[PDB]
Amino acid sequence: MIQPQTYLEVADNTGARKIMCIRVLKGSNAKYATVGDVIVASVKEAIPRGAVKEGDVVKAVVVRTKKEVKRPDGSAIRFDDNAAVIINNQLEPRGTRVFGPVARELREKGFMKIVSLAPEVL
Amino acid sequence: MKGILGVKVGMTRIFRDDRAVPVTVILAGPCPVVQRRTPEKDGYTAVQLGFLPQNPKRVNRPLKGHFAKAGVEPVRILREIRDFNPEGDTVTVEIFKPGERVDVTGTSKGRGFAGVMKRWNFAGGPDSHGAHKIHRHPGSIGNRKTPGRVYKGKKMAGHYGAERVTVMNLEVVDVIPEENLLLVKGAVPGPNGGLVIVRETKKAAK
Amino acid sequence: MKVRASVKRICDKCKVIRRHGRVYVICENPKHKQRQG
């Protein structure tokens, strides 16, 4: 569901759909890279070419596995942990990416692009 | 602004365009069992009861205390100040309107006797490089010539369940005038299928 | 302005004001707020 130190997944312009975040970008007292949140990290996994690198950005929270509990008592869980990498502003990293729909995301809102972008099966 | 009750159980419901969860308040309807007139108890107020547990069972005193303004045949009773009795019998079949905010409390389910572990926060000590106490145990208690001894009022092990308490604001959600019941989405303060009460205070400027 | 001390007035006509054992110099220039009580 969350974590501080983390081996997380992504799938943007990733070096590798994996980076380790330090912590949560929220109210100074992290403890939860939580669903639909924004946080900090560097790469863990490799990267053929790609302008990505073995650095560190911050970004926004996708999937989780341990209760995506929504306002409308909409409920879900994906046996997957990953978010999209950000470039400053938030403005996402890559041109596309491998994943899809569901409230929590769009709802957080700031990232419509991610929104229309990851649609279909997967 | 007060309701007397037999707290039922907590359960989930739906509102507007979304579900959320409530609780079951139930109260026949207490009545003017005793009044502190002010000249009577210048701490003026109303004391009432709200049900009835067997009559064959009942001390004379009770029988006549009732006699007083005479009412019925119960045992559930208690009091609250600064609350007029624009009646001589109360139910809530309106008494408590929904879509309103409330404050309320009740008996507090009865814990046990667990130290630094329970009672207080922070789950005990640590575990491994040390096991001659494995995982948790009691913090520290004072010192040499500081106060020169053992302190006097920091949290402490044991019995911390047989007590009572309340919750600040909560929502009145809904009113079922028939079976004198009300759904309120509440911290089920203390058990359920037992005793509670509600009162409303909050000149709270957001 | 203040200082647990000093104060020998200043603004050429800076006022020695007696207020609450409060050695407070009053003038016509903020520069002199002399609070030494």
Add this chain to the structure above:
Amino acid sequence: IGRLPIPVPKGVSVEVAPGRVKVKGPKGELEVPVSPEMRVVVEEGVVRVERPSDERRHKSLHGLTRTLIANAVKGVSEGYSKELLIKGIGYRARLVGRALELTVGFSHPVVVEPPEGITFEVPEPTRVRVSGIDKQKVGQVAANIRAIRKPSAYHEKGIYYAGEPVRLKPGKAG
């Protein structure tokens, strides 16, 4: 010799009562303080403050009872109106009845109320002030209003007593 001479014209209700001096004129039944030793008279047209000594306490007391009750009188004679001028591109003003129109906080609700001798005068409103009765409480309320926005040394847009020369300092660099 000097710190105690004043006449009580108008035949004002110039009298001393329960250890309090009662000065009654246009109505201002002003209560002018009476230190037990100060003492005073009002005969013919002459009203005098006496001095049961002349040391520090007393002498100041003299300057006072004299000046302040003198007040009691001049006051009871007219009605105490404080002349005041509101001025600033950023501000509005009208009596409204019994408050303080006022507007220069860019979220203008300024509904005030008139304490007592206080009558509101909007004849402008650039020129605009109040009338009171009680010289102390009047200068005061006036103040309350001034205070609530008035300041501005470097750029004006405030309320001003008579409106002192408002000393002003430059803004940026030029």
Add this chain to the structure above:
RNA sequence: UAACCGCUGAAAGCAUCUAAGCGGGAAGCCCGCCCCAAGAUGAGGCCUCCCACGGCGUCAAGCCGGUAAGGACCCGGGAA
């Protein structure tokens, strides 16, 4: 009310917030918020109720029944 801002005013026959008297003012102080609490011998306040209980050397503040006025005991049950 803290610093800090003012009103009315002398002693310093012009002035000053300043002993005099009045006001402004801090997430802080008493309260308002919940939780204890007359073993606060300085309460108990109110309600109902058995009778002023019955025998003994007056000083009967001792005995026995007195009242199931009530409660305890044992039993049986309890998120206590």
Add this chain to the structure above:
RNA sequence: CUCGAUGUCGGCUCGUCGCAUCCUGGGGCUGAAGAAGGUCCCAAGGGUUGGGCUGUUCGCCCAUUAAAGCGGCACGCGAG
């Protein structure tokens, strides 16, 4: 005083007071436009993060943060 006996570090866990207060606010001051800094007096209310390496508390460094204070109590804590 103590050698017929007082366990010294580092850390842990539970901490308790303190103000020369760090974040908090209240402020007069500015070389104060705004914003933002910086300059003192008032006030402890709550608050006063994770890791790295180093047995080191200090420290230097990563990432934030409103902020990530100094210190009293044998540099609190072995009858924990």
Add this chain to the structure above:
RNA sequence: AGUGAGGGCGCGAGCGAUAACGUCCGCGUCCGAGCGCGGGAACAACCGAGACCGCCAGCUAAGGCCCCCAAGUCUGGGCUAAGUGGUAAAGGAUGUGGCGCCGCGAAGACAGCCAGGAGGUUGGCUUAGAAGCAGCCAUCCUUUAAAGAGUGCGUAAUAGC
């Protein structure tokens, strides 16, 4: 026969930082070793005072007398009023009260007031401006409210206070 090492206080030299309930020596007292009573809150050595034993006797030290607790909430004359009492220096100040002193042209005072704030006062440099109120000094005259070689708000001098 016993101590053969002791400390404290005051004064006088060491030393030490002219620090320490430091340690060195000396004059004295001290305290132990009596120094058991008073006492100053209570405190081995700071002022009083030597206890052989009594008194339901009286005079006194020191130091005390509103009360807690014996003893005038004495009298008399002041001076502070901050609570100093109820630890502190450097140093700061129209604190408080006191000198022993200076201004009184009732040729009626000072803060408060009124009005004029006088004509050569007009470069000296700089004059873009000094024509007191821009920098290197000027130290004169007439003239009356008695006279500003102009103490001061200032820009372009100047003009106004």
